[PDB]
Specification:
With 86 residues, the chain is mostly beta strands. Helices cover 0% and strands 57% of the residues. It binds one DNA strand of 7 nucleotides through residues 11-21, 37-43, 50-52, 55, 66-71. It comes from Xenopus tropicalis (Western clawed frog).
Length: 86
Amino acid sequence: PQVLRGSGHCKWFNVRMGFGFISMTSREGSPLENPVDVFVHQSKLYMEGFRSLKEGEPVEFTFKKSSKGFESLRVTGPGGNPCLGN
DNA sequence: TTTTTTT
């Protein structure tokens, strides 16, 4: 299960659900011709207090292909900063 | 405080 690095933005996030998706726009330091969705759980989000992503906020993350699809493993804001959230 | 794969 190879671990890759990517960036993108929050496609959507539902706080009642505790999960959402990231639209990945770069991967392994190269931009993608077409964005790819990557699953993100609230538990993976680097921030203090209650954990969420705002729609649209820019993210940096590690991910791995999973049986259910891609799975984020740790998500941060630009430059390793905390995610913004709602 | 948050239904672990869709929006």
